[PDB]
Amino acid sequence: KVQLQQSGAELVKPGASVKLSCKASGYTFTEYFIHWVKQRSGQGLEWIGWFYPGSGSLNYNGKFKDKATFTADKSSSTVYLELSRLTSEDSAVYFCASHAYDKEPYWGQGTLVTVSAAKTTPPSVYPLAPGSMVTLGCLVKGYFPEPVTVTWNSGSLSSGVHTFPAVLQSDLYTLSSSVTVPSSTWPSETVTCNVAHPASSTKVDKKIVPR
Amino acid sequence: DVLMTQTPLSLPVSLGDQASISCRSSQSIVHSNGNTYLEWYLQKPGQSPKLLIYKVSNRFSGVPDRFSGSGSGTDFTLKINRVEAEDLGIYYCLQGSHVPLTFGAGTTLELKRADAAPTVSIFPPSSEQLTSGGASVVCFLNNFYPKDINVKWKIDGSERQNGVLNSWTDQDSKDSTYSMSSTLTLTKDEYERHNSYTCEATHKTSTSPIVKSFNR
Ligand SMILES: CCCCC[C@H](O)/C=C/[C@@H]1[C@@H](C/C=C\CCCC(=O)O)[C@H](Cl)C[C@H]1O
Numbered sequence: 001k002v003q004l005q006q007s008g009a010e011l012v013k014p015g016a017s018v019k020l021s022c023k024a025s026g027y028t029f030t031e032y033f034i035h036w037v038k039q040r041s042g043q044g045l046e047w048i049g050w051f052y053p054g055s056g057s058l059n060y061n062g063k064f065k066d067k068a069t070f071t072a073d074k075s076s077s078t079v080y081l082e083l084s085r086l087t088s089e090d091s092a093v094y095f096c097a098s099h100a101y102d103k104e105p106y107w108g109q110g111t112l113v114t115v116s117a118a119k120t121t122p123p124s125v126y127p128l129a130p131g132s133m134v135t136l137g138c139l140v141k142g143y144f145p146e147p148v149t150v151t152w153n154s155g156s157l158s159s160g161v162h163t164f165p166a167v168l169q170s171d172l173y174t175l176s177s178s179v180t181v182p183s184s185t186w187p188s189e190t191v192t193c194n195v196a197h198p199a200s201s202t203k204v205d206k207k208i209v210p211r
Numbered sequence: 212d213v214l215m216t217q218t219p220l221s222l223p224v225s226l227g228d229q230a231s232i233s234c235r236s237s238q239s240i241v242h243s244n245g246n247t248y249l250e251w252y253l254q255k256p257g258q259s260p261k262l263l264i265y266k267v268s269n270r271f272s273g274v275p276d277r278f279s280g281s282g283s284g285t286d287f288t289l290k291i292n293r294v295e296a297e298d299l300g301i302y303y304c305l306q307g308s309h310v311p312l313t314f315g316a317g318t319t320l321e322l323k324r325a326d327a328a329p330t331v332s333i334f335p336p337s338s339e340q341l342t343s344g345g346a347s348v349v350c351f352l353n354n355f356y357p358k359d360i361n362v363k364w365k366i367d368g369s370e371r372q373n374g375v376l377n378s379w380t381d382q383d384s385k386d387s388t389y390s391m392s393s394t395l396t397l398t399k400d401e402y403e404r405h406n407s408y409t410c411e412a413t414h415k416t417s418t419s420p421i422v423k424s425f426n427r
Contacts, residue, residue, distance in 0.1 A: 035312070045252075045260065045303055047312040061311040095259060102246065104265040109258075126337040128349055131425040135332040139340070139347055139394070159385075162353060164378040164392040175378065176392045178332070178351045211335075 002026040004098055004108035011145055012086050012115050019082040020111050022096035029077040030054030035105070036068070036081045037095040048094075051079055083113070091115045091168075118144040118171040122200035125193065127208045128176070134183045136208045138193035140166075141174045149196040150177045157181070157191070213237055213306055217315035223323035223357070224299075230291040232318045234304035239284055241308065248307030251280055251289045255300040256381055263302075264289065294320070299382075321358070324387040328416040329355035333409075333423040336402060346402035348395040350410035350423065354388040357415065362393045365409035371395065403427070 007021040022034060036048040049060040051070035058070050067090070069082040083090055093112050099105035121144045128137030140148055150163045157179060166175040177193060185191075187210050196203040214237035224230050234249070241247050249267045252260035262271045264280035267287065277292040291298055299322060304315040329352040336346040352360060358379075364371040374397060380390040393410060406427055411420040 044317050045305075045314040047314065050310075050312075059310055063311075102244070104262060104269075104271060105250075107259045107262070124340075124343065126340045126347075128334040128337070130332070131335060135330070135351060135353070137332075137334060137349060137351065139337070139349055141340075141345075141347065162351070162380055162390045162392075164380060164390070167376050167378055169376060169396075174347075174376070174394065176349055176351070176394065178353060178390075178392070180330075180353070 002098065002106045004096055004106060006094075006096060006108040006111045009112040010114070012090075012113060014087065014115055014117055015085055017082060017084045018086065018113060019080050020094055020113070021078050021080050022098075022108055023076065023078045024098055025077065027098075027100070029074060032098045032100050034070075034079045035097045035099075036070070037097065038092050039095070039110075040089075040092045048081070053079060086113070086115045088115055114145065114168075116144060116168065116171040120144060120199050121172060122197050122202045123148060123173075123195055123204075125195050125204050125206045127193075127206050128178075129208050129211050131211065132183055133180050134186055135178055135180045136186065136191055137176055137178045138195070138206055138208075139174070139176050140195055142172045143174075143197055143200075144172050145199055146173060147198070148173075148175070149198075150175075151194045151196075152177075152179045153190070153192055154194055212311055213240060213309050213313050215304055215306055215313050215315040217302075217304060217318050219318060220316070221319040221321060221358075223321055224294045225323050226294055226296060228294045230294050230298075230320060232289050232302055232320075234282075234287040234289070234315050236285045236287075236306055238309075240306045241284070246308075247283075249280075249282065249287050250305045250307065251278075252303045252305065253298070253300050254303065260303060291320075296322075321382055322387045324356050326416050327354060327356045327388055329353060329360065329391075329412050329414055329421060331410065331412050331421045331423045333425060335408065335425050335427070336399075341399055341402075344399045346397045346399050348397070348402075348408050348410075350393045350395075350412075352391040352393065352412050354383070354386065354390060355414055355416070356388045358382070358389040359415065360389075360391055361413040362391065363411040363413070363420070364393070364395050365407075365411065367405050367407050 053072040123143035160180040163177040166173040251264040254260040
């Protein structure tokens with residue numbers, strides 16, 4: 001079976017460089033092309049270039065000539081993509097793909113690259129209480145890195161919940177989560193958001209109380 | 212470079228529907244060796260794109276036979292015979308005949324449902340955030356359809372643009388709607404110097420915005 005193993009998620013300081021790896025198995029390494037593809041969050045696929053380990057031949061999309069460098073280590077069936085001087089625009093998932101000439105390609109699972117200068121930081125969690133149904137919320141602000149896990153009432157409240165994708169602002173993540181319940185349930189019953197952040201090994205609760 | 216133009220940008224479908232989506236290249240993509248390297252991919256959130264069709268019309272191993280590709284020259288089409296839920300996602304075409312290799316911008320297949328206006332809710336800063344010296348005003352625009360929507364912030368009657376951050380959910384697994392969150396962030400100082408805060412939701416279901424506000 002052709003398999004491509006890509007390296008794990010990278011947290012990269014702004015301005016620094018990073019080297020991503022794609023380790024191949026299940027075929028003669030020197031006889032397949034490797035391509036790299038970029039995908040920014042919520043955007044489409046961009047081709048970076050191709051590299052043929054068996055000769056060292058390569059080609060870059062001109063859009064990436066000052067940003068990407070392909071190399072290989074034949075002794076470990078690995079090809080590398082080095083990205084130089086990272087900016088916010090370089091934050092993306094990077095996929096590698098492999099194929100023999102005139103044959104269909106096999107894709108790796110992708111490597112997430114996130115650019116930020118932040119250190120590990122637990123979230124501040126703030127209650128969102130309103131001024132037949134009622135909508136409540138929690139604002140989960142200023143954490144790093146992803147992910148957090150948000151639940152309501154320790155998971156017993158799952159329907160009517162929207163937890164929104166986090167956004168990076170000033171190098172830290174912010175997200176919100178909403179829950180909608182019958183007015184006959186709140187504030188007469190307890191509604192609490194729970195936020196776990198694995199990187200900081202923290203979990204905090206915030207009960208939503210009327211203003 | 213070869214421009215790949217996919218249409219439509221989005222296609223609402225019901226399960227069991229026929230679907231047909233198009234990919235047109237700006238120039239011929241017949242390679243000098245005689246082959247046409249045109250591929251179709253389906254991508255779901257958080258996953259790698261999966262290969263469906265290669266060399267115009269060939270189904271990749273393991274791909275259901277309800278998928279078929281055709282075309283010649285600059286004109287290519289992917290068809291689905293009876294859409295199933297696992298077919299929902301974004302479809303990309305890719306030409307591999309001329310470097311640089313280029314992708315289409317994607318066609319989203321999403322589940323059709325009745326149009327629905329957003330449920331809009333606005334929230335002033337928590338006292339906890341204020342005590343900490345910050346101020347975020349949050350607006351939820353929930354369970355609407357279709358996905359296109361616009362939010363506008365107003366402070367004391369005046370439109371605000373800076374300090375607004377938006378986030379959107381994927382189509383809901385249970386009710387097929389979309390939701391959006393909009394957060395206006397301010398310093399505590401500026402927040403206390405104004406009175407009315409307003410978030411306005413413009414959606415196709417109405418001519419006028421849904422307007423939510425509060426006063427300090
Ligand atoms: C993410 C891209 C995946 C691969 C797309 C497509 O399957 C590949 C097409 C290849 C074409 C373009 C790829 C690399 C150019 C290599 C030219 C050379 O052999 O010197 C070559 Cl000409 C043959 C064909 O197999």
